[PDB]
Structure formats: structure tokens, C-alpha cells
Amino acid sequence: VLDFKWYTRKAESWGVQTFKNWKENLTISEKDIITGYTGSKYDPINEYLRKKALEKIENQIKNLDAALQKSKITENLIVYRRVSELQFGKKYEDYNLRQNGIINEEKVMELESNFKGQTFIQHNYMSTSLVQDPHQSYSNDRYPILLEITIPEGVHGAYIADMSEYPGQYEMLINRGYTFKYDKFSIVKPGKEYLKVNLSIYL
Ligand SMILES: [Cl-]
């Protein structure tokens, strides 16, 4: 399993190299929509459901789907994604997993009880980073959960950092529609504490 940890230079070198030919075979519309996605207020699936406005969104989806279906990750890979408690559903907005930098142990035990061994469908495209916590937009300061995600060789995703509005996110964009399993819950101490949640793809 390839895991770049905090090694931004090695990760960038691999991501640019291994997705170079994919990128050069993208259409003008596909490149435009990838970049637009990285700077957009809304997730286009979430938006398509919420809503010339509707033409724009359907086209975004057609082009993102087409782009990502052309890419296959070449190695088993670890990627990283910071999220809030909303990960577990809308009702978890106010869960208060973390107070004053400290992860609440009994709340971790409750999440583990409710979710360990269960799956969820990631309906939206899934933005992740090739290294852990590279960018302040998706930081440990704001987000009390780090998803540490194991991706098998062959999954449809692509390194898009040099096309992004925010290249320093070191983004691996994973296609929409994959199912993921909650495998492990662990508290990581420094500096705020966080909850590390290991996920795997469930094909
Ligand atoms: Cl906090």
C-alpha cells in the first residue's frame, strides 16, 4: 500500500507522473469542469438534487463522470480526508465530538458502536488528499475527524492538484458512487486531538 504520509514532494511527483497521460487526454470541457469543481461553492450531485442552471449541473456531472471513468489508480493507496461530524449524518451537526481540543471518549465509543462495520454510499464526488493535512482549508483546527482511506488498485480517481484552484490540497479526486466501510476508530493525541477513522472501499 502506497502511503505518502507528509511527503509532499514525493506525492506531487507521483501524482503528476502517474496521471500525466490521463490529463493530456482530457477534453477542454473535462479540464474546465475539474478545475471549476475544485473552486465551487456546491457539490454538483448535492446541488443537482437541491435544485440553464440545471443544464450547467447535468453537464458538470457528465464531464466529471467521463473524466474520472477514464482514470484508474495504479497502486493500492492511502488517501486522507478531513470531515466534521456531519460525516455521520445531518443530526450529528451538534454532536460535540471535540471540546477545547479534546476528543470525548464516550462519543468515540458511541460512533464506534453505531458505525464500526457498517457502510455508507459516498454519493458526491470524493475529494481527498494524497498527504495528510496539507492545507489550512481542511485542517485539524477545524475538523475533528481524519478519514484514512484505503483504496484498491483500479478505482476510478485521479490526481488533479496542478489543475486545481487550490493545488496545495494535493487532491486525489475519487469518483462518485462508491461505498465505503467504517473499519476502525482511534483517538490521536498531539495541537488538538482528533478521531482517526479508517475506511476501505466496498466494491
Ligand atoms: Cl475543539
- CATH number 3.90.176.10 is the correct assignment for the domain at 1-203: yes
**Residue 22 in contact with residue 70, Cβ under 8 Å?**
yes
Neighbours of 171 (CB within 10 A): 29
Binding residues for NAD(+): 38-50, 81-84, 122-124, 138, 171
For residues 67 and 62, give the distance between their C-alpha atoms in angstroms, rounded to a whole number.
Answer: 9
User: What residues does 171 pair with on adjacent strands?
Assistant: 129
Q: Which of 30, 37, 98, 127 is catalytic?
A: 127
Active site residue 127: yes
In eight-state DSSP terms, residue 133 is S
**Residue 188 in contact with residue 194, Cβ under 8 Å?**
yes
For residue 99, how far is its CA from the centre of ligand 1 (angstroms)?
5
Active site residue 9: no
The one-letter code for the residue type at 72 is: K
16, 162, 194, 196 from 13: Cα distances, Å: 6, 11, 29, 26
Active site residue 171: yes
For residue 67, how far is its CA from the centre of ligand 1 (angstroms)?
38
User: What residues does 103 pair with on adjacent strands?
Assistant: 98
Q: Which residue has the cell 483546527?
A: 141
For residues 129 and 36, give the distance between their C-alpha atoms in angstroms, rounded to a whole number.
Answer: 18
3-state helix, strand, coil in the chain (%, to 5): 40, 25, 35
Q: Which of 171, 176, 178, 182 is catalytic?
A: 171
Would you kindly state where each structural domain of the chain is located, as residue ranges? 1-203
CA 160 to chain centroid: 12
Neighbours of 49 (CB within 10 A): 11
Resolution (A): 1.8
For residue 145, with 0-12 CB atoms within 10 Å meaning exposed, 13-18 middle and 19 or more buried, which class applies?
buried
181: nearest Cα among 161, 153, 152: 152
Cα-only R_g, the chain? 17
Experimental technique for the deposited model: X-ray
For residue 178, how far is its CA from the centre of ligand 1 (angstroms)?
30
